[PDB]
Design a protein around this motif. Sequence first.
Motif, PDB file in Angstrom:
ATOM      1  N   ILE A 286       0.874  -1.182   0.000  1.00 24.86           N
ATOM      2  CA  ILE A 286       0.000   0.000   0.000  1.00 24.86           C
ATOM      3  C   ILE A 286       0.913   1.235   0.000  1.00 24.86           C
ATOM      4  O   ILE A 286       1.488   1.587   1.032  1.00 24.86           O
ATOM      5  CB  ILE A 286      -1.014   0.020   1.172  1.00 24.86           C
TER       6      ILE A 286
ATOM      7  N   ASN B 185      -0.411   6.075   3.058  1.00 25.90           N
ATOM      8  CA  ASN B 185      -1.313   4.922   3.203  1.00 25.90           C
ATOM      9  C   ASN B 185      -2.132   4.908   4.510  1.00 25.90           C
ATOM     10  O   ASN B 185      -2.976   4.031   4.695  1.00 25.90           O
ATOM     11  CB  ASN B 185      -0.501   3.625   2.998  1.00 25.90           C
TER      12      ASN B 185
ATOM     13  N   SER C 153      -5.897   4.615   4.008  1.00 28.55           N
ATOM     14  CA  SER C 153      -6.214   3.232   3.614  1.00 28.55           C
ATOM     15  C   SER C 153      -6.280   2.316   4.838  1.00 28.55           C
ATOM     16  O   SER C 153      -7.295   1.651   5.050  1.00 28.55           O
ATOM     17  CB  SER C 153      -5.188   2.709   2.594  1.00 28.55           C
TER      18      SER C 153
ATOM     19  N   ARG D 143      -7.933  -7.049  -0.497  1.00 28.35           N
ATOM     20  CA  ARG D 143      -7.964  -6.204  -1.713  1.00 28.35           C
ATOM     21  C   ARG D 143      -7.763  -7.029  -2.995  1.00 28.35           C
ATOM     22  O   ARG D 143      -8.573  -6.963  -3.923  1.00 28.35           O
ATOM     23  CB  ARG D 143      -6.863  -5.132  -1.637  1.00 28.35           C
TER      24      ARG D 143
END
Length: 97
Positions: free
Chosen positions: A59, A63, A66, A92
Motif C-alpha cells: 500500500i 497509506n 487506507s 484487496r
Amino acid sequence: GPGSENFSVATEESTEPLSEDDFDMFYEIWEKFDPEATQFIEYSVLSDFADALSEPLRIAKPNQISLINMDLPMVSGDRIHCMDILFAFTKRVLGES
C-alpha cells in the motif's frame, strides 16, 4: 488399467491470484519491523511496513487513510498481529468486499 483414458471426473489444481513468492516477500519484509519474531508490530510502524512491501501486498505511502478504512483489529489498543495484517492486505487482491 482403467477405461475412458482420462478415467477421472475432477481435478486438484487450485486457482487464486497469489503465489508462494508473495508470502515469502511478506515474511522477508516483516523481519525488518519484528526482528524479535513476536508476530506483532505497532500501528505507528504499520504504515512504514505497508510501504516496505512489493506489489500487490504493498500500500504505497501515504497509506494511513487506507489503513484507517480497513477492518484491522488491535491486540492491545496499539499493536496488531502478523496474520491479521496479512489478511487485511490480501483482502484487496482477493476482491472480498
